[PDB]
Design a protein around this ligand. Structure first.
Ligand SMILES: O=C(O)c1c(-c2ccccc2F)c2cc(Cl)ccc2n1Cc1ccccc1
Length: 558
């Protein structure tokens, strides 16, 4: 069946669409080549539609069924709970898209009559109606990139009331199930530090390691009605409340397998027969599905001792090498099996024999040394996208601050410390907004974070070594340097100068600002101050942080 079918109507915006980076004084300080930074618009929707629209031919086999049974036996041990309206309401972002039924995210959050009554009425319709397709809105996403142009991403999502009903029935499932089914292979149970720990141990545990990253072209579109039903069958293995069991059953047929696409004008856009990106089960469902297809493809291909790390469609395999000629063949056999399971490659996979050469979750493993000269492993990535997005956030007030998430997640990196910390700490201080909370996403979930809380947050996630790292690899230094030239970002010596300036100002303020100068900017000065465990880091409530993925699940923690 076709992934999509269209009516001819256009994917429309609900407002004016900015695509060009503004010539702004503050963003210009970070990036000069403004014409190389763009945001995607609905003007590219058609190129994405051509790329995502195709017919799927799936052929499941003995290896696929064996693994599915192994996965169900593990799912059998889970006892999932049904969240109340109030608990489900509390997990709604304050700026989540309002309902088409005269209420919004703030009404949901405050548990207002119009909101609570409508959610209850949607819940009963899921218990009573097991057939009628649920309506979704199709929108082109607005994301920022650097040139060399990408076409817009298509986002599919149901109404507010429905989204609160998915939380009541599925939130605890998507939170505890993947870890019970997959174990150490579920990448969302880890922080960045724990992620390096697992990749290094897995690599070092093999006698002769071989690794590869497998890229699926338009994974959401490769997902069939069969894959979605097989997914519900893993969910049914949970101990469930009668109403939750019915809601999962109804949501699977009416929403998860396919449904009507409606544009912002209210016109009919077409029909979806694959994965909606704006649902609660997108993260969990894609992880399980990618893990099932890959695990069975390893057996079919005769690849030895497979250890895998899955985060939705992002998959990395670390196995036992059988030699060059053997490895090449087995990797093609793996691809052959994935194509049959309806997961063909975007860019063909390559056998790697050095961990640092593999890219998984846009990241790669790299080495730097601590204050005591000992080797420290950390996750990095190419800084182009994070820098182009930080420039946009400087000129325009965005709902989610990617720059803040990049600081937290990539805190030990050369680029987050020197550029991202310096740029924002200068601007915020000059505006008296260092203690003003900001929204960011960690693993799809929304968090309200004060920039001044960063030293404690980094010490917990990355240890004190995040504030002492030096002697970065030549490769890492070359990548940072060539990117700065490309985007027209000032050299590292200008950043070192700018850092010295903020550090002083932060130190004279005292309180939490002095903690920021001492820890975050100790790299910028030769007379290094004494760095000890911050009292506040000991009692940080970092639960809920690295548990599960919630991309498109409309989730708000804190
Ligand atoms: O965007 C994520 O969800 C995310 C981040 C991340 C990066 C910056 C800010 C906030 C974040 F959450 C991340 C960072 C590292 Cl070092 C490793 C994996 C990571 N993921 C999972 C992931 C799964 C699939 C594809 C990409 C990333």
């Amino acid at each position: 069946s076709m992934s999509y079918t269209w009516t001819g109507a256009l994917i429309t915006p609900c407002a004016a669409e900015e695509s060009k980076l503004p010539i702004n004084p503050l963003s210009n300080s970070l990036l000069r080549h403004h014409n190389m930074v763009y945001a995607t618009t609905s003007r590219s929707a058609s190129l994405r539609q051509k790329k995502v629209t195709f017919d799927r031919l799936q052929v499941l086999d003995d290896h696929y069924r064996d693994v599915l049974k192994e996965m169900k036996a593990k799912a059998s041990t889970v006892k999932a709970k049904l969240l109340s309206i109030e608990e489900a309401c509390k997990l709604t972002p304050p700026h989540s898209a309002k309902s088409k039924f005269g209420y919004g995210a703030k009404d949901v959050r405050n548990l207002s009559s119009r909101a609570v009554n409508h959610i209850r009425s949607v819940w009963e319709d899921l218990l009573e109606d097991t057939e009628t397709p649920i309506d979704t809105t199709i929108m082109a996403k607005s994301e920022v990139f650097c040139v060399q142009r990408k076409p817009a991403r298509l986002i599919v999502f149901p109404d507010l009331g429905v989204r609160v009903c998915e939380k009541m029935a599925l939130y605890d499932v998507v939170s505890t199930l993947p870890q019970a089914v997959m174990g150490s292979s579920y990448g969302f149970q880890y922080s960045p530090k724990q992620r390096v720990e697992f990749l290094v141990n897995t690599w070092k545990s093999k006698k002769c390691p071989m690794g590869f990253s497998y890229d699926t072209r338009c994974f959401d579109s490769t997902v069939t009605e069969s894959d979605i039903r097989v997914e519900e069958s893993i969910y049914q293995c949970c101990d469930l409340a009668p109403e939750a069991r019915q809601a999962i059953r109804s949501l699977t047929e009416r929403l998860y397998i396919g449904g009507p696409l409606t544009n912002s004008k209210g016109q009919n856009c077409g029909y979806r027969r694959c994965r909606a990106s704006g649902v609660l089960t997108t993260s969990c469902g894609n992880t399980l599905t990618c893990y099932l297809k890959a695990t069975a493809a390893c057996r079919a291909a005769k690849l030895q001792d497979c250890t895998m790390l899955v985060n939705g469609d992002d998959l990395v395999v670390i196995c036992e090498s059988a030699g060059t000629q053997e490895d090449a063949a087995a990797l093609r056999a793996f691809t052959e099996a994935m194509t049959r399971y309806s997961a063909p490659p975007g860019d063909p996979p390559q056998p790697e024999y050095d961990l640092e050469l593999i890219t998984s979750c846009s990241s790669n493993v790299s080495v730097a040394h601590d204050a005591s000269g000992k080797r420290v492993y950390y996750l990095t990535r190419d800084p182009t996208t994070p820098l182009a997005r930080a420039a946009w956030e400087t000129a325009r007030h965005t709902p989610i601050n990617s720059w803040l998430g990049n600081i937290i997640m990539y805190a030990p990196t050369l680029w987050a410390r020197m550029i991202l910390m310096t740029h924002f700490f200068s601007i915020l201080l000059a505006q008296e907004q260092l203690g003003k909370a900001l929204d960011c996403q960690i693993y799809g979930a929304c968090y309200s974070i004060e920039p001044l809380d960063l030293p404690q947050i980094i010490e917990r996630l990355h240890g004190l070594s995040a504030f002492t790292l030096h002697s970065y690899s030549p490769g890492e230094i070359n990548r940072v340097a060539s990117c700065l030239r490309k985007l027209g970002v000032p050299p590292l010596r200008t950043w070192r100068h700018r850092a010295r300036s903020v550090r002083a100002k932060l130190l004279s303020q005292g309180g939490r600002a002095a903690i920021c100068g001492r820890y975050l900017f100790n790299w910028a000065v030769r007379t290094k101050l004494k760095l000890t465990p911050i009292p506040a880091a000991s009692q940080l409530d970092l639960s809920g942080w690295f548990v599960a993925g919630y991309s498109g699940g409309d989730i708000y923690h804190s």
